[PDB]
Amino acid sequence: SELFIVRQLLQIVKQKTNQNSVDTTLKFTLSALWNLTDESPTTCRHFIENQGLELFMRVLESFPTESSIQQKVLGLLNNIAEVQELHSELMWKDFIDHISSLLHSVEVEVSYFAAGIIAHLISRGEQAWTLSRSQRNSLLDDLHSAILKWPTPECEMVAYRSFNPFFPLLGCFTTPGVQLWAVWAMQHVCSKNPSRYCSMLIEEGGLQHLYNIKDHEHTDPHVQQIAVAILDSLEKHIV
Amino acid sequence: GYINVFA
């Protein structure tokens, strides 16, 4: 029944995209589909098995100027990128080249998910990247530098029910842009809404994973400089 | 993960 909902909302996205129609129903449909796939690999398989990926490429292409539409689409894809079993699905050139471009989007609400997709796909290692090896390395440093250009969002862009997705990213020491995205993302949601996340970031093991970054011999100065900024609010949250 | 916007 929830897969029916996903299929039906996907149907609305298909409909609105065929008619190239940016409107509150499409924007709400993406948001809905973004939520239904959160922390839901099962609802992510359906998005994928129901051609969501190719449909969302169509949305990204159809509405290259629609930053809200891009954010919600990428939001969903950020959720697919959290599922390892769905890695080879996003290993699609035309998709990554587009994501890779939205990585440099000025909209921070857009590039954040672009980066988070990228970060999750890079985080899977050298082997899992079935796309151009040169591009993955171009992304590796483009992902890093894109984050450094980012502004503080005006408000909370994304909501998280857990930080566990970010935890395996904290250990990508060979790929600091991946770690940079993770720590920036926690730095964002925590600082934006510390009454939500700060307790939970501790309660899931964030302290140690963040301490294994600050007090880590070889760590990118920026990745550490964010883990410092997070731990200051975390340690302030403890006392 | 989740969208901040409700409904």
Curated annotation (Swiss-Prot), chain A:
Shown stretch of the complete protein: 490 to 727 of 744
GN (gene name): ZYG11B
Protein name: Protein zyg-11 homolog B
Biological role: Serves as substrate adapter subunit in the E3 ubiquitin ligase complex ZYG11B-CUL2-Elongin BC. Acts to target substrates bearing N-terminal degrons for proteasomal degradation with the first four residues of substrates being the key recognition elements. Prefers Nt-Gly but also has the capacity to recognize Nt-Ser, -Ala and -Cys. Involved in the clearance of proteolytic fragments generated by caspase cleavage during apoptosis since N-terminal glycine degrons are strongly enriched at caspase cleavage sites.
Keyword Coiled coil: no
Domain of life: Eukaryota
UniProt key word Repeat: yes
Entry GO terms, CC: Cul2-RING ubiquitin ligase complex; cytoplasm
Subcellular location(s) per record: Cytoplasm
GO biological process, one term: protein quality control for misfolded or incompletely synthesized proteins
Coiled-coil stretches: none
Family according to the record: Belongs to the zyg-11 family.
PTM field: (Microbial infection) Ubiquitinated; leading to proteasomal degradation in the presence of herpes simplex virus 1/HHV-1.
Signal peptide interval: none
Keywords, ordered alphabetically: Cytoplasm, Host-virus interaction, Leucine-rich repeat, Repeat, Ubl conjugation, Ubl conjugation pathway
Subunit structure: (Microbial infection) Interacts with SARS-COV-2 protein ORF10. Interacts with ELOC/Elongin C. Part of an E3 ubiquitin ligase complex including ZYG11B, CUL2 and Elongin BC.
